Amino acid sequence: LPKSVDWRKKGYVTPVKNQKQCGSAWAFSATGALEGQMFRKTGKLVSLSEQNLVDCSRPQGNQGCNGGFMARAFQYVKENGGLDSEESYPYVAVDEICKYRPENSVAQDTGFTVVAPGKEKALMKAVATVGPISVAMDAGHSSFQFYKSGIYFEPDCSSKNLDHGVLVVGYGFEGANSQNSKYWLVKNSWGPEWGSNGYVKIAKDKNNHCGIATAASYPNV
Ligand SMILES: [Cl-]
Ligand SMILES: [Cl-]
């Protein structure tokens, strides 16, 4: 596998978004992964609608602004036959009426693939060969709230009880040895003001820190 990967350098990632006061991180993680797969398939980077997901995927088991799961969103895109663009179905941060329009669809998936649970080596392989991957993590910590630089490592992090969906856009390492002080490059959905331009480096190969490889998945396009 590559020693480092950064899909943002290849045009697969949109600018950082902000979920505001709505528990829709799961939807932002989902669109970020679909945005990268659509980019890989067509060479066109188009911002997708997290609102489409919030308002229309309750049948798949999502709960709009009260939470959800990336696999359930990819399932919604599959069953639904499409997903509209951010431009056509804007984000308002509140649960609203489903207004999915097939004519404005700019993405589709035939389902999704799951990364073997708890396997950081497996997630590394998915990131290197597919593109950005949706992952769940335990972000309920003040240290995460106030993160700004460096490799994030929090003793209270759990690898099992997770509460936030994010996007792994690559991985790297500090220094010259590609074998130590490794980290996952993660895109958050709390605006570009949070963290480092909206991103955070999370400790990699430190026992599935914060559960990054516990429930990873990506849409099949
Ligand atoms: Cl959330
Ligand atoms: Cl999921």
Numbering used by the authors: 1 to 221
Lines from the paper:
Addressing the elusive specificity of cysteine cathepsins, which in contrast to caspases and trypsin-like proteases lack strict specificity determining P1 pocket, calls for innovative approaches. Hence, we set out to determine the crystal structures of cathepsin complexes with representative peptides of cleaved substrates. As a working model, cathepsin V was chosen because of the resolution of diffracting crystals (up to 1.3 Å) and crystal packing with accessible active site cleft. Reactive site mutants C25A and C25S of cathepsin V were used in structural studies.
The pattern III group (binding shifted to the primed side) consisted of structures of eight non-protected peptides that all bound uncleaved into the primed sites. Electron density maps in the region from P1′–P3′ and partly P4′ of molecule A enabled an unambiguous interpretation. On the non-primed side, the MPD molecule occupied the S2 site, and the CL- anion occupied the same position as the carbonyl oxygens of P1 residues in pattern groups I and II. Its negative charge appeared to mimic the absent negatively charged SG atom of the reactive site cysteine.
